[PDB]
């Protein structure tokens, strides 16, 4: 047949995991993930749910078993820092996503293991190719994108990206389109500021380094007061 049935079901697994978006800019990258329907008693700043920081200059927006993803996230940190210790210089986003996407095929190569049920939208910056946005899935393939989604309702999200995305837009324009996308692909009756996570990458404070903030729930309110509803 030329198919793998566990791997088609691992792709069906990430299709249960809630919707996640990532959009590039002409100078930066954005990430925007939905937390699905959740109990009132869950904590809201201690819960490491969808987004993470893999070195000074790379993030991830994950959909899957978070438990699987944690090990890959940790190995990306270890590899990135060991690269930075090897070359005294930053790890490119593509080398990092290659290394993690190998592992996710290396288990898929095999009968002694299940493959990891995790998709990974990566944002990062380097002095190879500037800002890079990557996407990677349970079989271990990877692809670069300008604007992409993973997890549940991936297709409905890419139908909202397809016609609206204009190639030149800035970071703070993409912060609109992430919420236009997520709210149209919402898995809940409506959004609230605690139900989503965001992280961004920008060219330093101004020149030199890179700026790499995670939005805390008030900063998430601050981007919702804008591009919101009436």
């Amino acid at each position: 047949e030329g198919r793998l049935y566990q791997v088609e079901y691992a792709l069906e697994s990430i299709s249960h995991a809630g919707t996640a978006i990532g959009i590039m800019a002409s100078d930066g990258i954005v990430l925007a993930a939905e937390r699905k329907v959740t109990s009132t008693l869950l904590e809201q700043d201690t819960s490491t749910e969808k987004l993470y920081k893999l070195n000074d200059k790379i993030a991830v927006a994950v959909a899957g078993l978070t438990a699987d993803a944690e090990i890959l996230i940790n190995t990306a940190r270890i590899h990135a820092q060991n690269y930075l210790k090897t070359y005294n210089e930053d790890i490119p986003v593509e080398i990092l996503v290659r290394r993690l996407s190998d592992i996710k095929q290396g288990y898929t190569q095999h009968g002694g293991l299940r493959p990891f049920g995790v998709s990974f939208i990566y944002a990062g910056y380097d002095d190879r190719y500037g800002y890079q946005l990557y996407t990677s899935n349970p079989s271990g393939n990877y692809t670069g994108w300008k604007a992409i989604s993973v997890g549940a309702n991936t297709s409905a999200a890419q139908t909202l990206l397809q016609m609206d995305y204009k190639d030149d837009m800035k970071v703070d324009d993409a912060i609109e389109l992430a919420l236009k996308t997520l709210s149209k692909t919402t898995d809940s009756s409506a959004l609230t500021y605690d139900r989503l996570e965001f992280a961004t990458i920008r060219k330093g404070a101004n020149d030199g380094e890179v700026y790499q903030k995670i939005f805390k729930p008030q900063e998430i309110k601050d981007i919702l007061v804008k591009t919101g509803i009436t």
Binding site: T75, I103, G106, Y107, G112, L113
Partner: protein
């Protein structure tokens, strides 16, 4: 070269091999074979490339369930 080198690197397994020799002389051919066959179906069945720790039930068969080595803080 260093007088403790190799001697400490192999201490974990070499002491276990000698402990199986006491199991032979005190309890016959049955107990070391029984344990070394448990060792082979516990160590060789731990297939997990991202997990290099070894195995949790190994200490339940190895007496390391409630103890530390410098080798376990300095992997």
């Amino acid at each position: 070269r260093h007088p403790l080198e190799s001697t400490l690197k192999n201490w974990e397994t070499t002491q276990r091999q000698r402990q199986m020799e006491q199991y032979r002389q005190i309890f016959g051919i049955a107990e070391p074979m029984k344990r070394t066959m448990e060792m082979e179906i516990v160590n060789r069945t731990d297939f997990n490339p991202l997990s290099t720790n070894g195995s949790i039930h190994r200490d339940i068969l190895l007496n390391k369930e409630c103890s530390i080595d410098w080798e376990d803080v300095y992997p």
